[PDB]
Amino acid sequence: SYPIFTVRWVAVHTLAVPTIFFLGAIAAMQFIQR
Amino acid sequence: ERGWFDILDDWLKRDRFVFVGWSGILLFPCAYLALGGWLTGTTFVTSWYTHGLASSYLEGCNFLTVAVSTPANSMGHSLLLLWGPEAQGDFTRWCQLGGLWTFIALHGAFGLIGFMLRQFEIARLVGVRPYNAIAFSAPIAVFVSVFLIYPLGQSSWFFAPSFGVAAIFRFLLFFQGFHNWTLNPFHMMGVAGVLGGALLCAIHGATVENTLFQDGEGASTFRAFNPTQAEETYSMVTANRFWSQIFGIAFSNKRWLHFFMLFVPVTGLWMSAIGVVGLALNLRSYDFISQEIRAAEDPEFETFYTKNLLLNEGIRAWMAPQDQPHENFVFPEEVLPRGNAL
Amino acid sequence: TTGERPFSDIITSVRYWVIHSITIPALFIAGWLFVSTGLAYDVFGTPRPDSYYAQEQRSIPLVTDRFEAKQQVETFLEQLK
Amino acid sequence: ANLWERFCNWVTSTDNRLYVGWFGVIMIPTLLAATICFVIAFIAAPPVDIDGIREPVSGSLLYGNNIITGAVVPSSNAIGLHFYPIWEAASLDEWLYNGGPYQLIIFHFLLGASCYMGRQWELSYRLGMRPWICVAYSAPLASAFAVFLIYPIGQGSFSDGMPLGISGTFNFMIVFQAEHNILMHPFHQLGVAGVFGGALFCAMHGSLVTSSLIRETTETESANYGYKFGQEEETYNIVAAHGYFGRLIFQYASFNNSRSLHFFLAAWPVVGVWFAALGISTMAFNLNGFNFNHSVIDAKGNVINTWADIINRANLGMEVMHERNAHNFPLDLA
Amino acid sequence: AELTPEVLTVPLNSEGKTITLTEKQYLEGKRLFQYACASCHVGGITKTNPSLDLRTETLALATPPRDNIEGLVDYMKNPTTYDGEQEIAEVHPSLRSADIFPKMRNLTEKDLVAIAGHILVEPKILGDKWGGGKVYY
Amino acid sequence: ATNRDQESSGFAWWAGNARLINLSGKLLGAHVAHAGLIVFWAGAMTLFELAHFIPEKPMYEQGLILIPHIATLGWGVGPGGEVVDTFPFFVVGVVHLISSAVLGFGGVYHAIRGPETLEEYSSFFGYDWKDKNKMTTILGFHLIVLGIGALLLVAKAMFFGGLYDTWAPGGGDVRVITNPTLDPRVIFGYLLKSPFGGEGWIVSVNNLEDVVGGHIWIGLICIAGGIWHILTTPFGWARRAFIWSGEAYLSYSLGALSMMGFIATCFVWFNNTVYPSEFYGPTGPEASQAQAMTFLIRDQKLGANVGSAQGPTGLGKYLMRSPTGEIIFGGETMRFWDFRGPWLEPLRGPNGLDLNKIKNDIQPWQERRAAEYMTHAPLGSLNSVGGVATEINSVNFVSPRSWLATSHFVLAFFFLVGHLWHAGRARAAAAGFEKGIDRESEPVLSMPSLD
Ligand code: CLA
Ligand code: CLA
Ligand code: CLA
Ligand code: CLA
Ligand code: CLA
Ligand code: HEC
Ligand SMILES: CC1=C(/C=C/C(C)=C/C=C/C(C)=C/C=C/C=C(C)/C=C/C=C(C)/C=C/C2=C(C)CCCC2(C)C)C(C)(C)CCC1
Ligand SMILES: CC1=C(/C=C/C(C)=C/C=C/C(C)=C/C=C/C=C(C)/C=C/C=C(C)/C=C/C2=C(C)CCCC2(C)C)C(C)(C)CCC1
Ligand SMILES: CC1=C(/C=C/C(C)=C/C=C/C(C)=C/C=C/C=C(C)/C=C/C=C(C)/C=C/C2=C(C)CCCC2(C)C)C(C)(C)CCC1
Ligand SMILES: [Cl-]
């Protein structure tokens, strides 16, 4: 009935995809010691 | 004529979840890159070589202390293009030299242009007057005067605000110590517009909510409203009588009321921008000459004006060596201004 | 409505969660490794805790020239022994 | 119709040009007292020894001030939190030297303004209104209590209350930053979101309604004549406004219920300013903003400065210079 | 820059013998200094008497000298005025006065060495910041 | 689902607890379940504090607010406030934690299992908000319970070990209170003191005899008034002055709690008798005076004549006069001369600070106490960096007095807002226009115009 790949789909993922990657990078930072 | 231009126009203006428009060609890349540059820089990029500061989560800063900091003072007002003669195409060097700052500021400037074109573009399609775009000129005037004109008047981009929470707080305190910016009547008018706008927001929202007509039976009054109803949902006559008797005067024209709500904060922001244009040139409201002549000659004359200058002198001497590392200020302990004991 | 599928429809669909029970953790782990391998330091030029200063120096490696700034940073980076 | 019932019906009458009411019976004399003393003191009061060190500060116009530098100066630090009415002084000249007027103005003003809030409740009751306009006014009212009463109590002296003047206000803000790092306190940050957001939503609401006014006038006349006081029908098209703003962002980010829209306009600045008042009120008991001074340390243990440490340098300059003759011992503990 | 054995090597006594601390001792010295001493000595100053700091140069000219482990460990058992003339256990925390300074009750001899090592190493890291006060913050 | 949606009840989900107003049986459940939450936190928090407690560190260095409350009552402490036995802290925690299960059980039962209304089931436990006789009877029962509670403190003080007395000769100790103050001129004279500096209203109570005797008076008054309100019904003047409804009754209590929260804020900030500084840390006034004392002692040891040392302003560097002549500490702490504390009063003579006592009688324990309090001033950041705002990281400290005063000011403020909200709504609902103006009956349309 509905399409899968729309403009809204692109807009959602250009934000959501880097967000998750960054959250994993920042989670890893909490275990860095000087 | 249904050529490729008109077919493209058709596609750009489809009613979708996120409207695009012709303005979206400018708005979406520039807004996305400015935001992505700020998140990239605050997460991973240092300010060690430009400021002597750590400024990223990678280095151990938190949400309050991360920033994308301005370039080094030695860059002057360089565009700092990635392919320019300073970075020479080297992405890592570009990051270390402060290229993300001009990147965010310039893509942000064009992003803001694109958002205001979007307001115009949608308004013209829907058939409403473009007053939302007109009101948005005030955020643009603030952004352009603080982030572009101000450093362009100074020695370099270094003295522009850095993009971070605590970095902006430093910007506030620099403006007090060096510019005496609280004393500036253009700032005062801006404060009036912002606080007056918050006042009007609170009081109009509260007044509507407490002069509602009983248009339903539930104790939750929200449901008793229909977007297409013709009647006013609250009593302008009762509201007018309440405020006339409480405060002396009251709105009686609902069109004037809502234009005024537009006018007050928009005008305030515009006034503050003019004052910052002056500070670009150090054209400050720093002193009252009459007070200084009296105080120089009469060591018993003291006002809150003279008290605040002593505070500004403390700010300048105590923050300048760290805040302006390229100047190489060495201030021995004995020259630092200090009161008794402290 | 504008024709796209409702979000509440999508995120309660088994097929959405079959796909994103993989793609979400995969991206998270990719972000973690970007830091844990030390790659983030080298992409962006950010000091590690042991590379802000040389062992006995206490001066900042501050860039002071416009057109030789790239060479100045490279010189500062050599002097880390 | 006895004389007490006559008086009560006049006090509570909805026909007075300005409503009096029972709260107004306290409001009117206290506000008049505070207003008259303030105007006289602002023009002609002699210098005041605010910090108790026999170092009087001149606040009035006749003693060398303009509108920007003038103030009614807070009462002497030697008095602390002691009550200092006129009859506790040996003379008016003593009372003036010690900042007597400040106490008289703020106590009458805080009473009058609290009654102003009650008066807002009271008239809404007499007119058959819903009662919560006074709850919105509690946000600015709480803020006045914070800088004139609560902060003196926690610091132990009305001499650290906010001065009644323009440059005096700035002095208060700068010393507050030095002693509490208020910029780094989340309640002040919520306060800034309250008033920045309040100003944004103000211009937002005004621009959207103005953008969708229904054509009722010609171009040579003000569109304001297209609305008539008391008319039954709405004067703008909220559906067209929602249709514009929904497409500016996305549809579900836009209100189409005018009642909840207006509730949001009320709540955002009021809640924000409540947090601001609570910031001042809790820093009154020295629970201060976040301290990240020297939080970032390298492998050897060198301090790596952040923007927080630069803020600290500015705060130190304010700290060491404020009240420059008032401290004999190395810690400024109040 | 790194916390190296060179940094962690400090004078053991007045005769020029050195001892090299471990990173664990240094870090333990820091934690115990915060526990028992920093309320008055944060940053190497002395809040209740700012004329006397914990800079190594100041400790060298104390009587007896306190710029070494043994001098500092002796100070924490039986502190004196700067000229050695008077014993101040009654007003300064020490093992001798652990009854009235209860935080000293659970310090062992090995703890005193670690605290001492922290006081001697920190100036080698911080330079003028140690004992310098607010001017160097 | 009786009254469990917006259509049946008229209240949306975000005001869902308003659906309980006329469902006494479910309303009982909510109240009992909630009291269980209160008792749970008290029990659990005590245990957490105990697990994290090092007896050799002062309580105030360890983030403790509950153990200080227990120690003040005489349990677990001896001379000078030293902890001699942590077992009473354990007991108080365990018993509160165990009891919360009983209350949680009853609350959950009445909330979801028992009768939704109590009027059909029992006319003793049933009530109508508008029944002025029943409401004052329930009020009367709870006044008797409160009065018993105040007498339990008297019983602890007079018969079950006593109370911690910061003022006890010899440094502070648990002391049995044998002669509580009963003279009503003393007890009620506290109520007529000015709340301003040097007076301090009831916050100024400074001895355990007054504290215990005040609770004897409060106990009887509550029991008497509780009996009074069981046997009587509101008089005509009272009937005409109040709104008689559930929401109205709530609003009066919200006003009362707000007032008490503000009073508690000041109590913990100024009072060092029922909030001993040994347990809570020095007050702000206390620490500021202690700094003046510390440097007077230091400089006098170096040979300064502190009585005649003129400071830069012309006022004494160490000593000066208050506006009424008393000899007081100088510098900015001049504002704090109303402070009284056991470590300072031995230096006090009829005229204030006595220069002869200062020159000759300062004992080492006073120097120790002033240095400790000066360095534990109640100043600190939100992330618990102790000291002035410009201090560096090192000391993990925020005074219990700051935690307790800031939290209770915030709570008292919001409870004042809640009083205004619910009192204004109660008035409007009783009069019938809390949902909006009737279009066909708009009151302003029937009034003469203002001009
Ligand atoms: C202290 C907080 C508190 C308490 C005691 C209550 C109590 C109540 N609420 Mg309210 N409510 C609250 C907060 C609270 N609420 C909040 C924060 C909101 C906003 C979300 C609401 C919004 C709300 C609405 C919209 C409604 C209520 C209703 C009710 C009543 C019936 C609930 C029911 O039937 O659920 C049935 C739920 C279940 C059967 C699920 C489990 C419930 C149990 C009790 C969980 C207990 C678990 C516990 C760990 C077990 C311990 C047992 C052990 C001691 C042996 C009940 C008296 C209803 C009402 O008024 O009815 C007339 C109602 O419609 N509440
Ligand atoms: C003893 C105190 C008390 C009691 C019994 C009530 C009872 C009631 N209130 Mg009142 N109220 C109170 C105090 C109280 N209130 C206070 C102190 C305020 C000022 C803030 C209010 C302001 C208020 C308003 C504005 C309204 C009510 C309403 C009501 C009715 C519906 C309540 C409901 O279902 O909320 C449901 C509960 C929720 C939706 C949850 C709220 C979540 C809060 C904001 C979180 C707070 C943050 C937390 C403290 C810390 C962060 C937690 C996080 C990190 C997890 C009910 C009769 C409603 C009414 O008028 O009905 C007649 C209503 O509109 N109250
Ligand atoms: C009377 C209330 C009160 C007070 C004065 C204290 C005080 C303290 N607690 Mg305790 N505690 C409390 C309640 C309280 N707590 C509650 C309810 C819990 C269960 C959650 C705890 C569980 C607890 C633990 C597990 C610990 C403490 C600890 C501490 C100490 C350090 C606190 C800290 O660093 O805060 C950090 C500051 C914050 C988190 C700021 C909170 C900001 C809130 C969210 C704002 C809320 C505003 C308002 C209520 C909402 C209004 C909304 C509006 C729309 C109306 C300090 C002595 C620590 C300690 O040292 O133990 C020995 C510790 O480990 N407490
Ligand atoms: C103030 C709180 C309170 C109130 C007013 C009520 C009231 C009621 N309960 Mg509920 N209930 C409560 C708390 C409360 N309960 C608690 C804490 C529990 C768990 C123990 C229960 C579990 C419960 C069950 C399982 C049942 C009830 C029932 C009832 C109804 C009949 C009670 C009766 O006639 O007993 C007669 C009176 C007594 C037997 C005297 C008991 C004396 C107690 C146990 C000794 C302690 C007294 C002393 C004051 C306690 C101090 C406590 C304090 C320290 C906190 C009545 C409406 C019944 C019901 O709903 O029927 C349909 C029913 O079946 N209750
Ligand atoms: C929680 C406790 C509580 C509550 C809610 C009530 C509630 C009530 N009482 Mg009861 N009463 C109580 C405890 C309580 N009482 C106790 C402990 C006793 C024994 C002393 C009494 C003895 C008593 C008598 C003899 C009478 C009542 C009456 C009443 C009713 C009228 C109340 C009224 O008009 O007050 C309003 C308060 C006033 C009118 C006082 C004068 C107003 C002054 C100027 C206000 C000053 C405020 C100021 C800020 C004070 C600050 C502190 C101050 C002390 C310095 C009301 C139902 C009346 C009634 O109808 O009985 C059936 C009545 O005649 N009560
Ligand atoms: C305040 C209550 C203090 C605490 C806690 C600690 N110290 Fe201290 N220290 C304090 C004072 C007032 C003085 C001067 C004493 C005098 O009159 O001479 C000192 C001195 C020292 C010194 C000597 C410094 C020098 O000679 O230059 C040292 C080495 C010292 N203190 C160490 C020390 C340690 C290790 C502590 C924790 C166990 C400690 N101090 C706590 C005040 C206070
Ligand atoms: C720069 C650059 C670029 C770009 C890049 C980009 C575009 C990026 C993006 C990026 C991104 C896009 C990122 C993101 C991130 C995100 C994040 C990091 C988030 C986080 C979040 C959080 C953390 C949250 C929190 C919260 C809040 C806020 C509130 C609510 C609640 C909570 C708590 C949840 C390029 C390549 C072109 C070129 C070069 C340069
Ligand atoms: C109604 C309702 C509600 C509420 C509820 C509630 C509120 C409840 C409560 C509850 C409770 C309140 C509960 C409690 C419980 C408890 C318990 C269960 C306990 C136990 C204990 C124990 C087991 C102990 C143990 C121990 C010991 C003994 C010793 C020491 C150690 C330890 C700790 C281990 C809600 C909101 C959800 C909603 C719906 C409705
Ligand atoms: C314990 C103690 C004590 C004592 C105490 C006491 C004895 C108390 C009392 C108390 C009291 C005894 C109080 C009272 C209060 C009261 C009140 C708070 C009131 C109020 C009122 C009102 C609120 C009213 C209102 C109104 C009006 C005015 C008009 C008409 C209407 C109405 C009714 C609304 C002492 C200090 C010794 C010491 C410590 C401990
Ligand atoms: Cl001082």
What's the CA gap between F69 and F279, in Å, rounded?
9
What's the CA gap between D269 and B98, in Å, rounded?
37
CB contact under 8 A, D302 and E1: yes
What's the CA gap between D180 and F343, in Å, rounded?
29
What's the CA gap between E63 and E52, in Å, rounded?
13
Cα angle: F234, vertex F239, F245; to 5 degrees: 95
Given phi > 0 = left and psi -120 to 50 = alpha, else beta, which region is B301? beta
What's the CA gap between D207 and B259, in Å, rounded?
7
| Structure tokens belonging to residue B89 | 């195409």
| Structure tokens belonging to residue D284 | 């009154």
**DSSP assignment, residue F20?**
G
Distance E82 CA to ligand 6 centre (A): 10
DSSP string of B129-190, one letter each residue: -THHHHHTHHHHHHHHIIIIIHHHHSSSGGGSPPEEHHHHHHHHHHHHHHH-GGG-HHHHHH
What's the CA gap between E109 and D159, in Å, rounded?
51
Terminus-to-terminus CA distance in chain A, angstroms?
Answer: 55
Q: Going from the N-terminus, what domains does chain C have, and what CATH number goes with each?
A: 5-81 (1.20.5.860)
Q: Going from the N-terminus, what domains does chain E have, and what CATH number goes with each?
A: 2-130 (1.10.760.10)
**DSSP assignment, residue F113?**
I
Alpha-carbon distance values, B336 to B77, B180, B315, B316, B319 (Å): 32, 20, 11, 10, 11
Query: Does the Cβ of E120 fall within 6 Å of ligand 6?
Result: no
- Is D313 within 8 Å of chain E by CB? yes
Asked if F317 and F298 count as a contact pair (C-beta separation under 8 A), the reply is no
Residue of chain C with shortest Cα separation from B88? C70
Radius of gyration of chain A (CA): 15
Alpha-carbon distance values, E47 to E39, E86, E131, F333 (Å): 8, 21, 11, 17
**How buried is residue E79: exposed, middle or buried, by Cβ count under 10 Å (0-12/13-18/19+)?**
buried
Distance F191 CA to ligand 9 centre (A): 9
Structural domain spans, chain F? 1-281+378-451, 282-377
**How many C-beta atoms lie closer than 10 Å to residue F433's C-beta?**
22
What's the CA gap between D176 and D276, in Å, rounded?
13
What's the CA gap between D104 and B235, in Å, rounded?
40
Asked if F47 and F93 count as a contact pair (C-beta separation under 8 A), the reply is yes
**DSSP assignment, residue F122?**
-
Instruction: Pick from B62, B229, B236, B241 the residue to mutate for testing the F interface (most F CBs within 10 Å).
Output: B241
* D244 contacts: CB under 8 Å, gap ≥ 6: B122, B123, B126, B128, B132, D208, D211, D212
Asked if D82 and D107 count as a contact pair (C-beta separation under 8 A), the reply is no
Q: Where are the alpha helices (DSSP H) in F336-447?
A: 355-360, 364-374, 400-431
Residue from the list F82, F390, F394 with its beta carbon closest to the beta carbon of E34: F394
H or E stretch covering F93: helix F87-108
Which among F183, F199, F202, F275 is the best mutation to test ligand 9's pocket, defined by most ligand atoms within 8 Å of the CB? Answer: F202
CB contact under 8 A, D298 and C52: yes
Report the length, in residues, of chain C: 81
**How buried is residue F377: exposed, middle or buried, by Cβ count under 10 Å (0-12/13-18/19+)?**
buried
Which residues of E fall within a CB distance of 8 Å from D331? Answer: 47
Report the length, in residues, of chain A: 34
CB contact under 8 A, B173 and D314: yes
Residue among D79, D128, D125 nearest D99 (CA) = D79
* E101 contacts: CB under 8 Å, gap ≥ 6: E93, E94
Terminus-to-terminus CA distance in chain F, angstroms?
Answer: 54
- Strands E9-11, F327-329: parallel, antiparallel or unpaired by DSSP? unpaired
Three-class DSSP labels, chain D = CCHHHHHHHHHCCCCCCCCCHHHHHHHHHHHHHHHHHHHHHHHHCCCECCCCCCCCECCCHHHCCCCCCCEECCCCCCCCCCCCCHHHCCCHHHHHHCCHHHHHHHHHHHHHHHHHHHHHHHHHHHCCCCCCHHHHHHHHHHHHHHHHHHHHHHHCCHHHCCCEEHHHHHHHHHHHHHHHCHHHCHHHHHHHHHHHHHHHHHHHHHHHHHHCECCCCCCCCCHHHHCCCCCCECCECHHHHHHHHHHHCCHHHCCCCHHHHHHHHHHHHHHHHHHHHHHHHHHCCCEECCCCCCCCECCCCCECCCHHHHHHHHHHHHHHHCCCCCCCCCCCCC
What's the CA gap between C66 and B167, in Å, rounded?
24
Three-class DSSP labels, chain E = CCCCCCCCEEECCCCCCEEECCHHHHHHHHHHHHHHCHHHHHHHCCCCCCCCCCCHHHHHCCCCCCCCHHHHHHHHHCCECCCCCCECCCCCCCCCCCCCCHHHHHCCHHHHHHHHHHHHHHHHHHHHHCCCCHHHC
| Structure tokens belonging to residue C51 | 């590379």
Asked if E71 and E60 count as a contact pair (C-beta separation under 8 A), the reply is no
Q: Letter for the amino acid at F331?
A: G
Q: Letter for the amino acid at B332?
A: P
Cis, bond preceding E64 (omega within 30 deg of 0): yes
Which residues of E fall within a CB distance of 8 Å from C56? Answer: 1
Give just the sign of the alpha carbon dihedral F380, F384, F386, F392. Answer: negative
Phi, psi (degrees; rounded to nearest 5) at F386: -75, 145
Asked if D102 and D77 count as a contact pair (C-beta separation under 8 A), the reply is no
Asked if B201 and B219 count as a contact pair (C-beta separation under 8 A), the reply is no
Alpha-carbon distance values, F379 to B51, B141, D87, F270, F412 (Å): 31, 41, 36, 15, 22
What's the CA gap between F218 and F202, in Å, rounded?
14
Which among E10, E41, E69, E108 is the best mutation to test ligand 6's pocket, defined by most ligand atoms within 8 Å of the CB? Answer: E41
Q: Where are the alpha helices (DSSP H) in F160-276?
A: 184-189, 208-231, 236-241, 246-270
Per the annotation, does F211 bind a ligand? yes
> What is the third-level CATH fold of F282-377?
Arc Repressor Mutant, subunit A (1.10.10)
Residue among D329, B307, B303 nearest F311 (CA) = D329
- The three-state secondary structure class of B196 is helix
What's the CA gap between D216 and D235, in Å, rounded?
9
- The three-state secondary structure class of F165 is strand
* F391 contacts: CB under 8 Å, gap ≥ 6: D291, D293, E42, F385
Which residue segment(s) compose the domain that D118 sits in? 3-186
Which residues of C fall within a CB distance of 8 Å from B86? Answer: 66-67, 69-70
**DSSP assignment, residue F56?**
T
User: Among all chains, which residue has been given the structure tokens 């105990």?
Assistant: F50
**How many C-beta atoms lie closer than 10 Å to residue E90's C-beta?**
16
| Structure tokens belonging to residue F215 | 């609770």
What's the CA gap between D50 and D48, in Å, rounded?
6
**How buried is residue C1: exposed, middle or buried, by Cβ count under 10 Å (0-12/13-18/19+)?**
exposed
- Strands F380-381, D287-288: parallel, antiparallel or unpaired by DSSP? parallel
Distance A20 CA to ligand 7 centre (A): 9
Asked if F409 and D285 count as a contact pair (C-beta separation under 8 A), the reply is yes
Q: Smallest CA–CA separation between B224 and chain D, in Å?
A: 9
Radius of gyration of chain C (CA): 23
**How buried is residue B67: exposed, middle or buried, by Cβ count under 10 Å (0-12/13-18/19+)?**
buried
Distance E53 CA to ligand 6 centre (A): 8
CATH value at residue D13:
1.20.85.10
Residue among F146, F127, F147 nearest F137 (CA) = F127
What's the CA gap between B262 and B201, in Å, rounded?
10
Asked if F251 and F426 count as a contact pair (C-beta separation under 8 A), the reply is yes
Asked if F117 and F25 count as a contact pair (C-beta separation under 8 A), the reply is yes
**How many C-beta atoms lie closer than 10 Å to residue D305's C-beta?**
24
What's the CA gap between E93 and F182, in Å, rounded?
45
Asked if F88 and F50 count as a contact pair (C-beta separation under 8 A), the reply is no
Residue among F298, F309, F305 nearest F367 (CA) = F298
Closest residue to atom 38 of ligand 2, CA basis: F14
What's the CA gap between B301 and B291, in Å, rounded?
9
**DSSP assignment, residue B126?**
H
**How many C-beta atoms lie closer than 10 Å to residue F98's C-beta?**
11
Residue among F148, F203, F154, F143 nearest F182 (CA) = F154
- The three-state secondary structure class of F9 is helix
Asked if A8 and B18 count as a contact pair (C-beta separation under 8 A), the reply is yes
The tally of CA atoms less than 13 A away on the side-chain side of residue F79 is: 5
F394-423: buried (b, 16+ CB within 10 Å) or exposed (e) per residue? bbbbbbbbbbbbbbbbbbbbebbbbbbbbb
Per the annotation, does B107 bind a ligand? yes
Phi, psi (degrees; rounded to nearest 5) at C68: -115, 15
Q: Solved by what technique? A: X-ray
Given phi > 0 = left and psi -120 to 50 = alpha, else beta, which region is F65? alpha
